[PDB]
Amino acid sequence: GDKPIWEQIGSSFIQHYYQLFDNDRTQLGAIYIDASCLTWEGQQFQGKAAIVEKLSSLPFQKIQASITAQDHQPTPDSCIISMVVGQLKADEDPIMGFHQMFLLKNINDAWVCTNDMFRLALHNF
Amino acid sequence: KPIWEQIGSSFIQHYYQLFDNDRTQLGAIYIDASCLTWEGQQFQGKAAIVEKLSSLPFQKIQASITAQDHQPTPDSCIISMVVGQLKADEDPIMGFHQMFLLKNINDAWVCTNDMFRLAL
Structure with missing residues (x-):
């Protein structure tokens, strides 16, 4: 019927x-x-409070994310797993490539994120 | 090193x-x-997956992993995410991103979900 629900x-x-x-x-x-x-960027943060403190404490003032590709699959436990490849433009930094993954689970009519992984692509110099 | x-x-x-x-x-x-x-195309089931990976058009390929990040989920799975570089035959080196969702089934870890993309 056209686009799957995940x-x-x-x-x-x-x-x-x-x-x-x-x-x-x-x-x-x-x-x-x-x-x-x-x-x-390789550091693990457990829990909502530590996650939000970490994302609020980034040193960028202005950031613009652009998605180059996004791929979504259902998992066998009824979760949704997504892989994102994109580009980031923060302040006057050079544009960086990134990858991001999200694991989504339906808890009380809302799809919430249990697992989030982020990593910047490094330029090979 | 943690268990996951x-x-x-x-x-x-x-x-x-x-x-x-x-x-x-x-x-x-x-x-x-x-x-x-x-690369955005979906291959469902073991038989479609193995056919697709067996039929890639190169003879010799070498991958190197540049970064590898691992997490446990609340429902007993592991998420593994990789950034790397590939050298297939005599083509130029290509960057890649790959993601695996592992689940413990019958006492062994198996991949349920696999997502691959070339860095363009």
């Missing part, structure tokens, strides 16, 4: 996450729960 | 050894209902 939920989750992330990241605690984990 | 990094690191070592040497042996780490998204 494609519609994943894609709208990605679009909402990056709108929040580009504009106000203290509002990012709404998509995460107490058991969520975040791995940002 | 030990399992993830071993899975990745196993996957890339088979991928670089004999890709018809890659159905060993997948189950029947695994799903693969390779």
Whole structure:
């Protein structure tokens, strides 16, 4: 009947996450729960409070994320797993490539993110 | 090293050894209902996955992993995410991103979900 439900939920989750992330990241605690984990550039952060503190303490003033590709699959436990490849433009930094993964689980009519992994692509010099 | 990094690191070592040497042996780490998204195309089920990876058009391929990040999920799975570089035959080196969702099924870790993309 056209687009599978994990494609519609994943894609709208990605679009909402990056709108929040580009504009106000203290509002990012709404998509995460107490058991969520975040791995940002190799460092692991357990729990909502440590996740939000970490994303609020980034040194960028202005950030613009652009998605180059997004791939969404259902998992066997009924979760949605998404892989994002994109580009970041922060302040006057040079444009960086990134990869990001999100694991989504339906808890009380809302799809929340239990697991989030982020890593910047390094330029080979 | 935490327990999910030990399992993830071993899975990745196993996957890339088979991928670089004999890709018809890659159905060993997948189950029947695994799903693969390779460069935006979806390959469903073990038989479609192994066909696709066995039929890639190169003879010799070497991957190197640049970064590898591993997490446990609340439902007993591991998420493994990799950034690397590939050298296939005599083509130029290509960058890649790969993601694996591992689940413990019948006492062994298997891949259920696999997503691959080339860095353009």
